[PDB]
Amino acid sequence: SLGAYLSEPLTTKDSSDESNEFLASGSSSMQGWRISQEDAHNCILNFDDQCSFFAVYDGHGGAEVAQYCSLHLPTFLKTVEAYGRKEFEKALKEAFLGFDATLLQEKVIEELKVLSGDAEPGKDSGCTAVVALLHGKDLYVANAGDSRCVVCRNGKALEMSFDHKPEDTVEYQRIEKAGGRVTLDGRVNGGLNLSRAIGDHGYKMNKSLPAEEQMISALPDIEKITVGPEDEFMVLACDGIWNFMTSEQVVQFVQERINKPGMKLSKICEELFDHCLNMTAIIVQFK
Ligand SMILES: [Zn+2]
Ligand SMILES: [Zn+2]
Ligand SMILES: [Zn+2]
Ligand SMILES: [Zn+2]
Ligand SMILES: [Zn+2]
Ligand SMILES: [Zn+2]
Numbered sequence: 001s002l003g004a005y006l007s008e009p010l011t012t013k014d015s016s017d018e019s020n021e022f023l024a025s026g027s028s029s030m031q032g033w034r035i036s037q038e039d040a041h042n043c044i045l046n047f048d049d050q051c052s053f054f055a056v057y058d059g060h061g062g063a064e065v066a067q068y069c070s071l072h073l074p075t076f077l078k079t080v081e082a083y084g085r086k087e088f089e090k091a092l093k094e095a096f097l098g099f100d101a102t103l104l105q106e107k108v109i110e111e112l113k114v115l116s117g118d119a120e121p122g123k124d125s126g127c128t129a130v131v132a133l134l135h136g137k138d139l140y141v142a143n144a145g146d147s148r149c150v151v152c153r154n155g156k157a158l159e160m161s162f163d164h165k166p167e168d169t170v171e172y173q174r175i176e177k178a179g180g181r182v183t184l185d186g187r188v189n190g191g192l193n194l195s196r197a198i199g200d201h202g203y204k205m206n207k208s209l210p211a212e213e214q215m216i217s218a219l220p221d222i223e224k225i226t227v228g229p230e231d232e233f234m235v236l237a238c239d240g241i242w243n244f245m246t247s248e249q250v251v252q253f254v255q256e257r258i259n260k261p262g263m264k265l266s267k268i269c270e271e272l273f274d275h276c277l278n279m280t281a282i283i284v285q286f287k
Helices: 064-077 088-102 106-116 169-177 247-255 265-276
Strands: 011-019 023-032 039-048 051-058 126-135 138-144 148-153 156-159 221-226 231-237 279-286
Touching (some): 011 039, 039 064, 039 126, 051 064, 051 231, 051 279, 064 088, 064 106, 126 148, 126 231, 148 247, 156 247, 247 265, 265 279
Antiparallel strands (some): 011 023, 023 279, 039 051, 138 221, 148 156, 148 231, 231 279
16 A cells, blocks of 8 residues: 555745734745755735735756745835835836846846756746735735735635736737747747746747836736725745646635634645645734
8 A cells, every 4th residue: 555655745834823913824845855946935914114025946957046036025025116106016016027127137046046046047937926015904926927815705616816927818818929929738839837936037038028028027016905803814925736636625624723723834835735736935924
């Protein structure tokens, strides 16, 4: 009796829990022992005055751009013009596009090289990014890629993203106009299976077109809600989760566990991974 256990690689779960007076969070990330990390994340409860910041980045191969996002993206966001003006949808768009542009700078590439371990990081590597910014009770979610953010609203899953993949109609139209194609197995020009990312500048080299019209685009879709009594929690996770479970199923899985005595949010993430089995998830429970 060995079944699937045999083929399953050595992994470990790196978990954490924090709280403030306004929310509680837990996260876990699972990594295999001999295959490289691909994911990174942020969980910053004290991001700014009345503000918290959460994010999942997924390198789809190399980890350096994912890592670099977790190290520099939150701080870059605070510098954009619209951020001090409290126009958060505009700020998030400015931050993704502005930060993407920094990846072509020589000094930035030096750091990407260290993070990586004739590679051209930022050109031949990149990551999907989903970011949740909470400013008081106002929740803004920016998504560029196939990680997902789901809120439990009125006892039901509410997608705050806006998942993107090459076969999607809007994605395909952009890829088409930019001279690209999508193989039957969902790969842009037969290479990457992503349509939105930070980095991967090798797919952003049409000098005719603005940044947001490149085959692979760093432009996030943004959605806002105002969280109140009926918004119990949110989940950010990578495609490792959504490949196996729908938004509804995940919300129900979290609901089946969240107010159980002694249950840590990070532990729910771990159990989610088990049920599903580089896996990364964050649960934020709103007070
Ligand atoms: Zn963490
Ligand atoms: Zn740094
Ligand atoms: Zn078309
Ligand atoms: Zn993916
Ligand atoms: Zn992934
Ligand atoms: Zn992952």
